[PDB]
């Protein structure tokens, strides 16, 4: 398995540390974080070296064990839509 | 498992000015931002500083455009001595009062899932006037009873407004008391803004302008006295109700005379005292 | 100074007489604060066979003498010692007797219309009203060792949760006021261990009740509570234990309790710190300790939890009790502060320093703050303090709060209401009620709440004859509580007011000053701290202190009840219970012990046919030894 | 002065109540109703208060 | 007796002075 033990720092300070398989994809991490937080996956946005993780596998982006990941949710306001 | 009703959110002076200015900047738009602070006790949620955020939207919705800014700015601010981390979000309702809508509730719900005691602050720039500022802090009631427990009257002192109730207050979200506590140096500078230099205190006026102003006001008082005469003769041949309408659209001599007399007498007293005080001080 | 001199000369005179009145001279010495002199005079008495006069003097000393003075008197007595007589006077001076007798009186005469509580319960819809009705019960059964309402309706009591359990448990200690005989076992029943474990709230409430059982009266409970507070783990239990210890060692400037309480305060926790601050206040009462005062002021200027700030605000004020002009430096330092809560502590300090003296300068300061300050809570605290200054001349409080009740600021309105409440306590003035009527329908809710509680305080125990407007106010309470269109805070106020109106059975009144005229320090402390339910509901169990029995009690030579009977020269209807809710004899006969109003004394008469003869005139009332 | 400040402080809610239309009465009729033209809209048959 | 009336009147005078000063302060602040 060799789980990739990462860190998930939130902009609020809390730390949802979690470990994932090597072949995980940013979509998979988003989805697991959404289950843990009970928030829709679209509202989340992961960060690494000031560079959003748009999509695709984690490895080729470079995300590795003992990494720093910032979890930043969306911010929306409006009467409708 | 309480969230007492004595819980308050402490907004600093700088945070308030930042929110208000950012909101007035985007008058027709629901501009928004983040707020940094700490979680001290179950009765205090202190908001220290805020920072605007890159964004784009229409008059009916607004949304963030980059999170890189959020993480980067947190790191830079932390470098120079403000480690505090985010405690909620704020936005501006320009003329709609202060309440939360569905989209607002959705974003606030994500934040609350991130951290339990997160708050939402709403400002209304155009509704705020010189003295008072229209503002309020909220949080989400779950689907469970009473949302919070009571151990004081600190919750029930505000009489929530009809518009906020109509739009969901006390049904989906509940308010929190806002405290504007300030330290000593903040107090000392807030008192020091309106203070002019010392020279302005001992400067006379262009005396020619003084005389012109005096003669102008007295030439006005002449006609005001004539009208005062023409108006005191009435008030006997006028019905007790009719008088309440005598002064609508028609100048009243009495009040204007009072105003002009106060103006003339203050201005002349101040100029005289300055002239004498100088006459002594400088040799 | 001159008043002291004159009182000395008067004492000299009272000494030179054919029948020197020893009650009067002992009162003169108390006021003169010379415990050595009373020690000597009481030695002289015990030497000669005047044991009845010595006993009455020991009674009067206990009723209206400061703890420090009484401790000095007992020390002096022990310096010389009649050893059996000596020890019986020791027992009287410890207050064990008087407290026990008052307890007996309270238990015997316990008519309580439970139908009213049943109606209030039927009207309950939320948790505020729930705790309101619990506290109101606690007031109805104050000291009467009866807990039927909490017993029969046990399921309804479980509804309360978290802190509402703290209050509901402390209600037990309030109900068993003075029941020193056996407390630890008593509380153990209602605070069962290993029963529903995981309730620090329950333990805190239990300790609060335990302390509440021993107001102003220390003993072994002091040591036990200190042991607990030293073994506490949960912050909640620290809070409870600190409050209990404060209520357990009032006025006794014990250094070890001060050290422990200060160690807790220096934790920088909120809910523990509030209790710690109030406790430091209640312990070092009266003492002008510069050390404790500076610790308070520094901490209040260093902490960041408004809860600690509130606790300290009342603690500091408690420290300076009884000092007329010696607090002026502290008053000025606090008033010119910038933190609002410290300014509030300053107003409270002015209140407690000039308690009853009517010092016009303290009034000037409080009124100037009331009209001139920018914070609203300071305004409210200022208007309220006026009540403490001017309570010896109730004719003057309306004169200086009528205009202030009709004020744009709601908090000032509430302050005027509660100031009238404290100032005119147990008097039933027509004027006070005339002011309290129109504003019981004030648009703002907490104003209504304060108005109802103020009325219940003023018109305690009065019947239909004494005040025409009592029935109106009972009906108003019922209508407010049953109604549903009205706010919750108003319902809380009405419930507490029903509790107040008929307290401790119907045989207890609130008298800031003893019947002689001395300021009753526990009453002042209780009515000040109870007033702080606007910040912490569990503090509402402090008007328990103000509850002083309205009893006329006869005693025999060996201090045991004689079955005497007395004459009440007024119609049986008036000066009696109003009624239990669903030719006039020109005299009525009361038995021993007697539920006697304060006013019923001016018309209280003894039947000369009876063999006994009271030592001192009945009219002063209160505890009386009887001669034969 | 206190009354003046209180009135000013309440005036914010009093000024958020709705208004009242101005109608021209055509003829009182029936038990207590009136027929009122509400310029520019049409006529109505409205009730009359107690006072 | 007349001594008591005298002291009563004098204290009434002090109280009236205190109240007058307080009302002046109240008016000045109510203007603001």
Curated annotation (Swiss-Prot), chain A:
Coiled coil: none annotated. It comes from the Eukaryota. Residues 4-78 form the Ubiquitin-like domain. It is found in: Nucleus, Nucleolus; Nucleus; Cytoplasm, Cytosol. Interacts with GCK; the interaction occurs preferentially at low glucose levels. Interacts with the proteasome. Facilitates the ubiquitin-independent proteasomal degradation of stimulus-induced transcription factors such as FOSB, EGR1, NR4A1, and IRF4 to the proteasome for degradation. Promotes also the degradation of other substrates such as CBX4. Plays a role in inhibiting the activity of glucokinase GCK and both glucose-induced and basal insulin secretion. Contains three domains that function in concert to promote proteasomal degradation of bound substrates. Contains a ubiquitin-like domain (Ubl) toward its N-terminus that is necessary to promote substrate degradation. In the middle, two domains termed Catch1 and Catch2 are necessary and sufficient to interact with unstructured regions within substrates. The long C-terminal region associates with the proteasome. This is Midnolin. The lineage of its organism: Eukaryota, Metazoa, Chordata, Craniata, Vertebrata. The gene is MIDN.
Swiss-Prot record, chain B:
Keywords: DNA damage, DNA repair, Hydrolase, Metal-binding, Metalloprotease, Phosphoprotein, Protease, Proteasome, Ubl conjugation pathway, Zinc. Pfam families: JAB, RPN11_C. Residues 9-144 form the MPN domain. One of its GO terms (biological process) is protein deubiquitination. A motif (JAMM motif) lies at residues 91-104. The modification Phosphothreonine is found at residue 239. Belongs to the peptidase M67A family. PSMD14 subfamily. Component of the 26S proteasome, a multiprotein complex involved in the ATP-dependent degradation of ubiquitinated proteins. This complex plays a key role in the maintenance of protein homeostasis by removing misfolded or damaged proteins, which could impair cellular functions, and by removing proteins whose functions are no longer required. Therefore, the proteasome participates in numerous cellular processes, including cell cycle progression, apoptosis, or DNA damage repair. The keyword Cell wall biogenesis/degradation does not apply. Its EC number is 3.4.19.-. GO terms for cellular component: cytosol; cytosolic proteasome complex; extracellular region; ficolin-1-rich granule lumen; nucleoplasm; nucleus; proteasome accessory complex; proteasome complex. Zn(2+) binds at residues 91, 93, 104. This is 26S proteasome non-ATPase regulatory subunit 14. The gene is PSMD14. One of its GO terms (molecular function) is endopeptidase activator activity. The keyword Transcription does not apply. The modification Phosphoserine is found at residues 128, 197. It comes from the Eukaryota. Widely expressed. Highest levels in heart and skeletal muscle.
UniProtKB/Swiss-Prot annotation, chain C:
One of its GO terms (molecular function) is enzyme regulator activity. It comes from the Eukaryota. GO terms for cellular component: azurophil granule lumen; cytosol; extracellular region; membrane; nucleoplasm; nucleus; proteasome accessory complex; proteasome complex. The modification N6-acetyllysine is found at residue 484. Keywords: Acetylation, Phosphoprotein, Proteasome, Repeat. One of its GO terms (biological process) is regulation of protein catabolic process. PC repeats lie at residues 167-200, 205-238, 240-274, 275-309, 311-344, 345-380, 381-413, 415-449, 450-490, 493-525. Belongs to the proteasome subunit S1 family. Component of the 26S proteasome, a multiprotein complex involved in the ATP-dependent degradation of ubiquitinated proteins. This complex plays a key role in the maintenance of protein homeostasis by removing misfolded or damaged proteins, which could impair cellular functions, and by removing proteins whose functions are no longer required. Therefore, the proteasome participates in numerous cellular processes, including cell cycle progression, apoptosis, or DNA damage repair. Component of the 19S proteasome regulatory particle complex. The 26S proteasome consists of a 20S core particle (CP) and two 19S regulatory subunits (RP). The regulatory particle is made of a lid composed of 9 subunits, a base containing 6 ATPases and few additional components including PSMD1. Interacts with ADRM1. Interacts with ZFAND1. It comes from Homo sapiens.
Swiss-Prot record, chain D:
It is found in: Cytoplasm; Nucleus. Signal peptide: none annotated. Component of the 19S proteasome regulatory particle complex. The 26S proteasome consists of a 20S core particle (CP) and two 19S regulatory subunits (RP). The regulatory particle is made of a lid composed of 9 subunits, a base containing 6 ATPases including PSMC5 and few additional components. Component of a complex with USP49 and RUVBL1. Interacts with PRPF19. Interacts with TRIM5. Interacts with NDC80. Interacts with PAAF1. Interacts, in vitro, with the thyroid hormone receptor (in a thyroid hormone T3-dependent manner) and with retinoid X receptor (RXR). Interacts with ERCC6. Belongs to the AAA ATPase family. Component of the 26S proteasome, a multiprotein complex involved in the ATP-dependent degradation of ubiquitinated proteins. This complex plays a key role in the maintenance of protein homeostasis by removing misfolded or damaged proteins, which could impair cellular functions, and by removing proteins whose functions are no longer required. Therefore, the proteasome participates in numerous cellular processes, including cell cycle progression, apoptosis, or DNA damage repair. This is 26S proteasome regulatory subunit 8. It comes from Homo sapiens (Human). The chain holds residues 52 to 102 of 406 of the full protein.
């Amino acid at each position: 398995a060799a789980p990739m033990s990462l860190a998930i720092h939130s902009t609020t300070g809390t730390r949802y540390d979690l470990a994932v398989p090597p072949d995980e994809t940013v979509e998979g991490l988003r989805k697991r974080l959404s289950q843990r937080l009970k928030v829709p996956k679209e509202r989340l946005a992961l960060l690494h070296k000031d560079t959003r993780l748009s999509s695709g596998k984690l490895q080729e982006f470079g995300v590795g064990d003992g990494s720093k990941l910032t979890l930043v949710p969306t911010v929306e306001a409006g009467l409708m839509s | 498992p309480a969230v007492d009703t004595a819980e308050q959110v402490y907004i600093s002076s700088l945070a308030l000015l930042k929110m208000l200015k950012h909101g007035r900047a985007g008058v027709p738009m629901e501009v928004m931002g983040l707020m940094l602070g700490e979680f001290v006790d179950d009765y205090t949620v202190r908001v220290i500083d805020v920072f605007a955020m890159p964004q784009s939207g229409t008059g009916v919705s607004v949304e963030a455009v980059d999170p890189v800014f959020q993480a980067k700015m947190l790191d830079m601010l932390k470098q120079t001595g403000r480690p505090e981390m985010v405690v909620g979000w704020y936005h501006s309702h320009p003329g709609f009062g202060c309440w939360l809508s569905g989209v607002d509730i959705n974003t606030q719900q994500s934040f609350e899932a991130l951290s339990e005691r997160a708050v939402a602050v709403v400002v209304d720039p155009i509704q705020s006037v010189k003295g008072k500022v229209v503002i309020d802090a909220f949080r989400l009631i779950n689907a469970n009873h009473e949302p919070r427990q009571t151990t004081s009257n600190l919750g029930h002192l505000n009489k929530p407004s009809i518009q906020a109730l109509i739009h969901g207050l006390n049904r989906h979200y509940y308010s929190i008391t806002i405290n504007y506590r300030k330290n000593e140096l903040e107090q000392k500078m807030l008192l020091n803004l309106h203070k002019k230099s010392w020279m302005e205190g001992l400067t006379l006026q262009d005396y020619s302008e003084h005389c012109k102003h005096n003669e102008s006001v007295v030439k006005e008082m002449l006609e005001l006295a004539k009208n005062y005469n023409k108006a005191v003769e009435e008030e006997d041949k006028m019905t007790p109700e009719q008088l309440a309408i005598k002064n609508v659209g028609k100048q009243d001599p009495k009040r204007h005379l009072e105003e002009h007399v106060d103006v003339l007498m203050t201005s002349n007293i101040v100029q005289c005292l300055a002239a004498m005080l100088d006459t002594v001080v400088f040799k | 100074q001159f008043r002291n001199k004159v009182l000395r000369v008067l004492v000299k005179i009272y000494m030179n007489l054919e029948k020197p009145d020893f009650i009067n001279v002992c009162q003169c010495l108390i006021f003169l604060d010379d415990p050595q002199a009373v020690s000597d005079i009481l030695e002289k008495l015990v030497k000669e066979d005047n044991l009845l006069m010595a006993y009455q003097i020991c009674f009067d000393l206990y009723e209206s003498a400061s703890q420090q003075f009484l401790s000095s008197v007992i020390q002096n007595l022990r310096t010389v010692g009649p050893k059996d007589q000596t020890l019986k006077m020791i027992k009287i001076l410890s207050g064990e007797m008087a407290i026990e007798l008052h307890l007996q009186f309270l238990i015997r005469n316990n008519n309580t219309d439970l139908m009213i509580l049943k109606n209030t319960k039927d009207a309950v819809r939320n948790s505020v009203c729930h705790t309101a009705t619990v506290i109101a019960n606690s007031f109805m059964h104050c000291g009467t060792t009866s807990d039927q309402f909490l017993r029969d309706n046990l399921e309804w009591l479980a509804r309360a949760t978290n802190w509402a359990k703290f209050t509901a448990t402390a209600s037990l200690g309030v109900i068993h006021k003075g029941h020193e005989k056996e407390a630890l076992q008593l509380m153990a029943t209602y605070l069962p261990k290993d029963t529903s474990p995981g309730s620090a709230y329950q333990e805190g409430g239990g300790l609060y009740a335990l302390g509440l059982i021993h107001a102003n009266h220390g003993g072994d409970i002091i040591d036990y509570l200190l042991n607990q507070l030293k073994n506490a783990s949960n912050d909640i239990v620290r809070h409870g234990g600190s409050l209990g210890l404060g209520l357990a060692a009032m006025g006794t400037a014990r250094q070890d309790v001060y050290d422990l309480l200060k160690t807790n305060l220096y934790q920088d926790d909120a809910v523990t710190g509030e209790a710690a601050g109030l406790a430091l206040g209640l312990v070092m009462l009266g003492s002008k300790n510069a050390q404790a005062i500076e610790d308070m002021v520094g901490y209040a200027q260093e902490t960041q939890h408004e809860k600690i700030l509130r606790g300290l605000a009342v603690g500091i004020a408690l420290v300076m009790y009884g000092r007329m002009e010696e607090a002026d430096a502290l008053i000025e330092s606090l008033c010119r502060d910038k933190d609002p809560i410290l300014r509030r502590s300053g107003m409270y300090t002015v209140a407690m320093a000039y308690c009853g003296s009517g010092n016009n300068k303290a009034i000037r300061r409080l009124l100037h703050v009331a009209v001139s300050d920018v914070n609203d809570d300071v305004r409210r605290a200022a208007v309220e303090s006026l009540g403490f200054i001017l309570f010896r001349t109730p004719e003057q409080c309306p004169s200086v709060v009528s205009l202030l009740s009709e004020s744009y600021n709601p908090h000032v309105r509430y302050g005027a209401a509660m100031a009238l409440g404290i100032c005119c306590a147990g008097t039933g003035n027509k004027e006070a009620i005339n002011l309290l009527e129109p504003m019981t329908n004030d648009p703002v809710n907490y104003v209504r709440q304060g108005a109802l509680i103020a009325s219940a305080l003023i018109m305690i125990q009065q019947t239909e004859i004494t005040c025409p407007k009592v029935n109106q106010f009972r009906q108003l309470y019922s209508k407010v509580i049953n109604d549903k269109h009205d706010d919750v805070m108003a319902k809380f106020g009405a419930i507490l007011a029903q509790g107040i109106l008929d307290a401790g059975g119907h045989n207890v009144t609130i008298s800031l000053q003893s019947r002689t005229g001395h300021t009753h320090m526990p009453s002042v402390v209780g009515v000040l701290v109870f007033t702080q339910f606007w910040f912490w509901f569990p503090l509402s169990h402090f008007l328990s202190l103000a509850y002083t029995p309205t009893c006329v009690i006869g005693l025999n030579k060996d201090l045991k009840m004689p079955k005497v009977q007395y004459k009440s020269n007024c119609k049986p209807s008036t000066f009696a219970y109003p009624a239990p809710l669903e030719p006039e004899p020109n005299f009525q006969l009361l038995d021993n012990p007697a539920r006697v109003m304060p006013a019923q004394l001016k018309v209280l008469t003894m039947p000369e046919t009876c063999r006994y003869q009271p030592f001192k005139p009945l009219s002063i009332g209160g505890i009386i030894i009887l001669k034969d | 002065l206190n009354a003046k400040v209180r009135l000013l402080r309440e005036e914010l809610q009093l000024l958020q109540e709705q208004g009242s239309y101005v109608g021209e009465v055509v003829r009182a009729m029936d038990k207590k109703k009136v027929l009122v033209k509400v310029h520019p809209e049409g006529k109505f048959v409205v009730d009359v208060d107690k006072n | 007796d007349l001594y008591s009336r005298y002291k009563k009147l004098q204290q009434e005078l002090e109280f009236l002075e205190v109240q007058e000063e307080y009302i002046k302060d109240e008016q000045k602040n109510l203007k603001k």
